[PDB]
Design an enzyme around this catalytic site. Sequence first.
Site: not given
Length: 129
Positions: A35, A46, A48, A50, A52, A59
């Site tokens: 990650e 992301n 969309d 969002s 992380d 998220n």
Amino acid sequence: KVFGRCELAAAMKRHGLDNYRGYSLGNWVCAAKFESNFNTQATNRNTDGSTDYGILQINSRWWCNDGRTPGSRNLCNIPCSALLSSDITASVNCAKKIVSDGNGMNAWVAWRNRCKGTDVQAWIRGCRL
Ligand SMILES: [Cl-]
Ligand SMILES: [Cl-]
Ligand SMILES: [Cl-]
Ligand SMILES: [Cl-]
Ligand SMILES: [Cl-]
Ligand SMILES: [Cl-]
Ligand SMILES: [Cl-]
Ligand code: NA
């Protein structure tokens, strides 16, 4: 902060992640490796909108507040900036809620795609724990 492999294994064990929800420490170390590459300050946007955050790439869609993810929740009741700290307590506390949410570590798509079913004990091999 960029952790070493055994340094992170030790910090995750100190915060009670080892065998949490039946996931051995090597699962957590492997998830963190893919990650964040063990970097607490890792951020990734992301498609969309969002974001992380942190060593476990938590998220903003569900888990933390960044003020710029419309319609999102903050189920860990933390600013997403808390997930970027050199101290991993907020990331571990929030990760415990995520892994309890019903799909276990499958919440972390990198864990599913790169760690699940592999020899995850290699990630803690040699570490004084
Ligand atoms: Cl490594
Ligand atoms: Cl393990
Ligand atoms: Cl928001
Ligand atoms: Cl919320
Ligand atoms: Cl906040
Ligand atoms: Cl820590
Ligand atoms: Cl599970
Ligand atoms: Na949010």
